Amino acid sequence: VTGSGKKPWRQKGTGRARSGSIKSPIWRSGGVTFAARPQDHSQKVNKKMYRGALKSILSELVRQDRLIVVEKFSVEAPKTKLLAQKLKDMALEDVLIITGELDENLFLAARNLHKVDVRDATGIDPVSLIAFDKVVMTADAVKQVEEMLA
């Protein structure tokens, strides 16, 4: 609150309120006493702890049998209707696509698909990985996620 430090004042002890300030938060409206500050809650993240939750969910993903792990899954082009027809052949729906090579013909695909997302395996995102119906995977990606967890 700006544009005045004035005290409305004219003493206290006259059958009324302190009338305290023209910038006070309590002054009907225009600024309140505990209104929000910028929040940045990110930490160090302890590496042995991080990698050890990812081992817990990576075992569970096998215990719930969701990792298909298609050998060299790819499309000819970054056209949504082709990638989507590939997944229909593979009889898959509403899936997390993991590229193993960050290849631009798969990375620029799939945008039109309602419940599909494409990410690279390098430091694979664990909040995404518990969502989605299946994990499409490549075997080259399964190799580089085990080395990040080694």
Partner 1 sequence: MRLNTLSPAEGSKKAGKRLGRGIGSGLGKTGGRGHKGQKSRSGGGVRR
Partner RNA sequence: CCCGGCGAGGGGAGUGAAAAAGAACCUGAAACCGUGUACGUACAAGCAGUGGGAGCACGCUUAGGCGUGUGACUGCGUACC
Partner RNA sequence: GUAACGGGGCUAAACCAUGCACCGAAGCUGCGGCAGCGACGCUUAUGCGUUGUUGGGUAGGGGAGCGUUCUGUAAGCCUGCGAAGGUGUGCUGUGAGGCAUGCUGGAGGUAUCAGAAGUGCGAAUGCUGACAUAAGUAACGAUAAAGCGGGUGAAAAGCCC
Residue 133 interacting with partner 1 (CB under 8 A): yes
- Under a CB-based contact definition with an 8 Å cutoff, are residues 135 and 105 in contact? no
As given in the structure block, the two tokens for residue 43 are: 């930490």
Beta bridge partners of 67: 135
Residue 10 interacting with RNA (CB under 7 A): no
- Chain CA centroid to CA 93, Å: 21
Each residue 82-121 as x (binds RNA by CB under 7 A) or -, in order, gives ------------x-------------------xx-x----
- Under a CB-based contact definition with an 8 Å cutoff, are residues 76 and 70 in contact? no
Each residue 44-83 as x (binds partner 1 by CB under 8 A) or -, in order, gives -------------x--x---x-------------------
Residue 90 gets which letter from DSSP? T
Q: Which does 146 bind (CB under 5 to 8 A by kind): RNA, partner 1, none?
A: none
**What gap in Å lies between CA 83 and CA 75, rounded to an integer?**
6
| Extended strands (E) in 6-114 | 96-99
In the bound complex, what is the minimum distance in angstroms from residue 88's beta carbon to RNA?
Answer: 16
Q: Which does 32 bind (CB under 5 to 8 A by kind): RNA, partner 1, none?
A: RNA
In the bound complex, what is the minimum distance in angstroms from residue 94's beta carbon to partner 1?
Answer: 10
